[PDB]
């Protein structure tokens, strides 16, 4: 139980790639380790637990973490990220096998997976707004990964992050941000003057 | 088997002492308050190993707890402050079964200096572009929740009555309206996307839905507009032809 740490508070892979989030302990007495997940709406849920019965310890959704007491460390890989697995995922250790004592906890690993878009045309449009307040919003849509959004300058207007979306039925996900403004000068044709595509249609 | 907190969101002003409270079904003998921020993981304030008992986490300065019957575990803020503004986290434990840790599902708490401050959100919804369609065979609705404080909102789309989850994309982090204010007010967005097929048809309904968390009927109101309470906003479009 005494101490533990998660060193790398951020981690970004690609959809398919190698997952290592770190955990690292210290204990003046024999540690009892877990793994705990935490995804977007939702709680705290056991991913894996060691107690002092095996080494190599297979967990849920895929995740299986080494207890190696010559390092002090038990980290938690997964073979293939998959977009599901976004979340922060918490380490934790304890003076009990089953964690009935108090769980010191380390500071969190959020983990974001960077989507392999399939076949992209990149493009902005304009959306009717539905009522008459003549504040369009404007829609970079369907851009490669790679591509960033950057904020605005001018500040009556208002850009948001890039966004990941899967229709699972179809098989399909793809990227988009929104810009908008109550400036009947707004051109959507320019917004979004920042690390843009030559290939985008209108 | 659940540990249910009385209240999953909360807006409080600085100076007012403050009831988190922590409720558990399973005859446990160990309760935990902890908190979660974002950067420093989770953090013990207080933990108790029976009825009356105490002990002091790692960050106990400024909180009070309470266990009063085996049941409950009542955390109190003296004296809110903002750097108490925090999502806390209620757990509980058997000694002997084997387990572990059940958590609640939390309660956010967002310490401000002044009640007139919150706002409940207005919700347009944003159509379909005729060119995406035409470009993709998709239709793309947006929803904009905007004129919201503090940052408490529960974003979610409807497609004839039963909640999809299926090709929404809602922003992880809003935007403030003002970001040269201290406190100003925030922006959210959302997005839905289906075929143009489900889009062109007349018979199918979209709403967007927009849970906010204020005020409870016990706050002191009596300003201008309405009370700034937990309500659901919507908005609504029909597909077209």
């Known amino acids: 139980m005494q101490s533990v740490t998660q060193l790398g508070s951020h981690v970004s892979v690609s959809e398919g790639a190698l997952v290592l989030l770190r955990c690292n302990y210290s204990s003046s007495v024999p540690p009892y380790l877990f793994w705990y997940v935490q995804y977007p709406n939702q709680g705290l849920q056991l991913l894996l637990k060691y107690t002092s019965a095996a080494t190599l310890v297979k967990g849920i959704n895929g995740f299986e973490a080494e207890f190696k007491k010559s390092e002090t460390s038990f980290h938690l890989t997964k073979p293939s990220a998959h977009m599901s697995d976004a979340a922060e995922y918490f380490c934790?250790?304890?003076?009990?096998?089953?964690?009935?004592?108090?769980?010191?906890f380390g500071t969190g690993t959020r983990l974001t997976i960077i989507p392999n878009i399939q076949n992209p045309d990149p493009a902005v449009y304009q959306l009717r707004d539905s009522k008459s307040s003549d504040k369009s919003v404007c829609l970079f849509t369907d851009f490669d990964s790679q591509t960033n959004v950057s904020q605005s300058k001018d500040s009556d207007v208002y850009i948001t992050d890039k966004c990941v979306l899967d229709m699972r039925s179809m098989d399909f996900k793809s990227n988009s941000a929104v810009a908008w403004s109550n400036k009947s000068d707004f051109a959507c044709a320019n917004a979004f003057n920042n690390s843009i595509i030559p290939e985008d249609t209108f | 088997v659940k540990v249910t907190q009385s209240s999953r969101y909360l807006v409080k002003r600085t100076g007012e002492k403050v009831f988190l409270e922590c409720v558990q079904d399973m005859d446990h003998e160990n309760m935990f308050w902890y908190r979660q921020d974002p950067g420093l993981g989770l953090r013990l304030i207080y933990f108790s190993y029976d009825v009356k008992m105490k002990e002091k986490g790692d960050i106990p300065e400024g909180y009070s707890v309470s266990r009063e019957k085996k049941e409950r575990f009542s955390l109190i803020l003296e004296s809110a402050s903002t750097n108490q503004t925090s999502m806390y986290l209620c757990?509980?434990?058997?000694?002997?079964?084997?387990?572990?840790?059940?958590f609640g599902s939390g309660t956010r708490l967002t310490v401000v200096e002044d009640l007139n401050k919150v706002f409940p959100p207005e919700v347009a919804v944003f159509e379909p572009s005729e060119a995406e369609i035409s470009h993709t065979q998709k239709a793309t609705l947006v929803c904009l929740a905007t004129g919201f404080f503090p940052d408490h909102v529960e974003l979610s789309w409807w497609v004839n009555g039963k909640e999809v989850h299926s090709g929404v994309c809602t922003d992880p982090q809003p935007l403030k309206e003002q970001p040269a204010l201290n406190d100003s007010r925030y922006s959210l967005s959302s997005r839905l996307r289906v075929s143009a097929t489900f889009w062109q048809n007349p018979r199918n309904h979209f709403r967007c839905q927009v849970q906010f968390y204020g005020l409870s009927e016990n706050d002191e109101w009596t300003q201008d507009r309405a009370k700034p309470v937990t309500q659901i906003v919507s908005a609504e479009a029909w597909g077209r032809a």
């Open positions: 934790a250790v304890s003076e009990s096998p089953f964690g009935n004592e108090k769980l010191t």
């Open positions: 757990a509980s434990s058997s000694t002997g079964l084997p387990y572990g840790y059940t």
